[PDB]
Amino acid sequence: IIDADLEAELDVDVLAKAFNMNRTDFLGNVTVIDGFASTGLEAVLVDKDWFMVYDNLHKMETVRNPRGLYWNYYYHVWQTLSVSRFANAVAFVSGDVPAV
Amino acid sequence: MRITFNDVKTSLGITESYDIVNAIRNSQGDNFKSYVPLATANNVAEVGAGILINQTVQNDFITSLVDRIGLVVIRQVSLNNPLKKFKKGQIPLGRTIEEI
Amino acid sequence: MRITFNDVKTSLGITESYDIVNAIRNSQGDNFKSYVPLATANNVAEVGAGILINQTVQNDFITSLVDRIGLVVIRQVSLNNPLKKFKKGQIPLGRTIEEIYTDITKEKQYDAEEAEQKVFEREMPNVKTLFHERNRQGFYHQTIQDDSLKTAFVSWGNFESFVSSIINAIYNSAEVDEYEYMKLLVDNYYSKGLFTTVKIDEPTSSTGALTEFVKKMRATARKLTLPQGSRDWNSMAVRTRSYMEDLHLIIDADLEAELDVDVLAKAFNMNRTDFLGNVTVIDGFASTGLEAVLVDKDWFMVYDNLHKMETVRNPRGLYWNYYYHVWQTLSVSRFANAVAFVSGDVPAVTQVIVSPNIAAVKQGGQQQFTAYVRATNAKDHKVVWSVEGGSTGTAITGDGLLSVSGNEDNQLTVKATVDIGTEDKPKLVVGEAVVSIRPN
Amino acid sequence: TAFVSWGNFESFVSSIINAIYNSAEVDEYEYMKLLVDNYYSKGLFTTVKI
Amino acid sequence: MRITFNDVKTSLGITESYDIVNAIRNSQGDNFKSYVPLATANNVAEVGAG
Amino acid sequence: FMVYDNLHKMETVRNPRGLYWNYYYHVWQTLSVSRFANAVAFVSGDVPAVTQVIVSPNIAAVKQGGQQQFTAYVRATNAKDHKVVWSVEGGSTGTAITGD
């Protein structure tokens, strides 16, 4: 997982990555998002089993107001968002990090 | 009840840059000589960027008649979760997940 | 009657360079030793470039006989519109096209205790509309004298082939004009300044400029392709997304060749779509700043209303007259992604967009306005809100909340202004919104 | 009142429903992105210094 | 060709006689009392003629 | 008469806590009259000599170098005739109307 601004820079300025474009055997699959909101995080290399996201509820219910003559829709989403500590996870930090 | 707008212009929230109509009119073959032979280019330039608020336009043959809307298009654009491939199944009953 | 030419030469409008015949004759094995063994090379050199005006040539065996024409070829070359793939269907009846877009909403946490009294709350969906109309009407005029043309041809097949060639020429002219109009649409959009401008240096200034331009284009395409979408790549300030196969980069051949040759990444990623979308090549933009335009397939809103051909006959002159009428709507959509890469001096702020363009409020209600500023730099700018309705008691705050006085009858105009000029010489960019007052 | 054809009316209603689903997907993406930031803040990652 | 009309009102060729719009509201026991219960009388009378 | 009805419906709701029914009868209608049909008032009180003046082209579109003819019909309650004065309130110099 990396951002587009840095991914384009690496792709253009590194000939190895430019040659190994849209390829999986070179550094796994690539996911592009908009920033990490962290002062040090640059890229994150994780495993498919790292995410432990599950769903508990996904439903929609509708009610009717006859005085106003309208329908009111509610969409309820309940889910578990967690990570697994048994999976591989590396974070590339480009700042001043502690020794340990 | 009855909501109407009056004295509305086609240049409400735009910022002119170089007045393309006048550029085409006074272009001495510099760059707009391609658009010079084009006929009814001013009409395209007037409403080529879309109209935010529309008004009734009378027919060019019989003034007493108005022009109707011949097509209605609804933009159907779907937004997807980039990280949805990492989602697992569903848990109807219970709250706690144990990993061994 | 009888039109003939005399004393015509085979070197009418040519400019000799080095007299290849004499060069071959006097070549001492330098470079024309390959053509020296060739026989009857002078005959090839005389008429190898074609004859503009031909004359009767007598037979070499019997002088009294002339040489006939053994083959007639009609050049059938078709000209196509490069941007024809962006055309939509046809509209037989009506003039106006309405486009409706629905935006996303917020999220509320689950609160059973709170939901006791607010079961019947009203939430207003975010809906925006755009309007287009027919703006191109034209026709093409041609004349054919079949009776007089029958002399120039011997075979019917060739006669009808020539007639079909004339018709195809008419269609080619129509296609060229359509391409010119579609190209003019982009220039009109840029002149009106509804594009999202990315400021770059001159690509031809240095090698690093080319790679910086490629990096910026790739980053912009990647950000546009993101599935979650964004609100900073369209003129309506609405959250929307694009597809990598739906992205089109319109650029000119002179710059495209430069980038392809001088950038190894683009050279490796040639004739590929996943790298910066599809590529369209045209001849210039007729704009002093425009270099390349990255648009979406839905950006073009071109429709057709009429495409017909009608023919009349003049019997006194014995000829046919053909008219080809083309009526179509040429417009663009402000809901689609559109980025323009400009390599000149651009203003700090391109435009300011107020989220609700048109609104209607009661005499005691309030309205919230959101301002999106399209700035070419990384700096931030403070907006100022004002209302020019005129009536007292109607007040707008710095945040963007407008409260309407209890009694007036006047259309309100709301202006969000950004000052980008220097001191004692202000330069204001204003975004406008229209508010109507319900009688209550 | 704003529509003439039923097909367009139901199309607009379905567009509203799809907008709801799009908002749900965007929120889910935001939560999944927040998970990584929370992990980094808690410092359970293996950090490579560059 | 694009023919548009700006700032037009529904009083082009209308020469009102007694202004029913306010004659109804400023009516106390007269023959106009029948239209007092009408809630949408003003809206009906605004564009009733055409 | 050009009277039509757009909506005629009834909605019912029940309050389990209060044990009662609420009925809402919604009526939406359009009420208008046509100016293309004959109509006579037969007024007995004092009436003005002239009731109204009708211009035959109510809406017209004209070229910048063109001319347009107008016709006036006066509704008179007596056999006496009246003259018509034509005026134009465009305000632009060079545009004027004749007495006919």
Q: What is the DSSP string of C96-117?
A: EEEEEEE---------TTGGGT
Largest separation between any pair of C-alpha atoms in chain E: 56
Residues facing C314 on adjacent strands: C319
Which element (helix H / strand E) includes C21? helix C20-25
Residues in B closer than 8 angstroms to D29, CB to CB, are: 81-83
Contact C135 B40 (CB under 8 A): yes
Instruction: Report resolution (Å) to 1 decimal.
Output: 3.0
* Inter-chain residue contact A67 with F24, CB threshold 8 Å: yes
List for chain F the helix, strand, coil content (%; round to 5).
0, 35, 65
First to last CA, chain C: 85
Breaks (C-N over 2.5 A) in chain A follow: none
Task: Among C223, C264, C269, select the one facing A4 at the smallest CB separation.
Answer: C223
Chain A contact for D50, CB < 8 A? yes
Is A77 in contact with D47 (Cβ distance < 8 A)? no
- Closest B-chain CA to F60: B63
Q: Helices then strands (H, E): number in chain E?
A: 2, 0
Q: What does the block give as tokens for E25?
A: 């509201």
Helix axis angle, C253-262 to C207-224, nearest 10°: 100
Sign of CA dihedral B32, B36, B42, B44: negative
> Given an 8 Å threshold on Cβ–Cβ distance, is B81 in contact with D18?
no
Residue A71 phi, psi dihedral angles, 5° rounding: -110, 145
CA distance C177 to C138: 10
Under an 8 A CB cutoff, do C103 and D26 touch? Answer: no
Query: Are F and C neighbours with ≥3 CB pairs closer than 8 A?
Result: no
Nearest-angstrom CA–CA distance, C245 and C85: 13
Say if the Cβ atoms of D32 and A81 lie within 8 Å: yes
Tokens of C413: 């105009």
DSSP-based three-state secondary structure for D28: helix
- Residues of chain C with C-beta less than 8 angstroms from the C-beta of D23: 104-107
- Smallest Cβ distance to B79: which of D12, D25, D32? D25
C262 and C213 in contact (C-beta within 8 Å)?
no
B86 contacts A54? CB cut-off 8 A: no
Q: Are C125 and C102 in contact (CB under 8 A)?
A: yes
Restricting to D residues 2-41, those with a Cβ less than 8 Å away from any Cβ of C are 12, 15-16, 18-20, 22-23, 25-27, 29
C278 contacts C248 by C-beta, under 8 angstroms: yes
Distance separating alpha carbons of residues C210 and F18, to the nearest angstrom: 77
Query: C276 and chain B: CB distance < 8 Å anywhere?
Result: no
Residue numbers in F near A69 (CB within 8 A):
11, 26
Instruction: Tell me the nearest-neighbour CA distance from C417 into chain D, angstroms.
Output: 31
The residues near C214 (Cβ < 8 Å, ≥ 6 apart) are: A12, C259, C263, C265, C266
Tokens of A60: 């929609």
DSSP one-letter code for C93: S
**Range list of β-strands (E), C388-427:** 395-396, 401-403, 412-419
Q: Residue A16, class by beta-carbon neighbours within 10 Å (0-12 exposed, 13-18 middle, 19+ buried)?
A: exposed
Neighbour count for residue F31 (Cβ, 10 Å): 15
Partners of A45 in the beta sheet?
A90
Q: Which residue of F has its CA nearest to E15?
A: F52
Beta pairing, strands C401-403 & C338-342: unpaired
| Other residues' Cβ atoms within 10 Å of the Cβ of residue C284 | 14
Alpha-helical regions (H) of C33-112: 41-47
Find the helix or strand (DSSP H, E) in which C171 lies.
Answer: helix C156-192
**Cβ atoms within 10 Å, residue A63:** 11
Q: Which residues of A touch F6 (CB under 8 A)?
A: none
Angle between helices C207-224 and A4-13 (to 10 degrees): 140
Q: Which two tokens mark C419?
A: 């000052």
The whole-angstrom separation of Cα A48 and Cα A31 is: 12
- Among B75, B76, B79, beta carbon nearest to D26: B79
Nearest to A8 among C110, C123, C222 (CB): C222
**Location of structure tokens 């599950």:** A54
Tell me the two tokens of residue C26. 């006097």
Residue A66 distance to chain F (closest CA, Å)? 6
CA pair distance C200, C344, nearest whole angstrom:
7
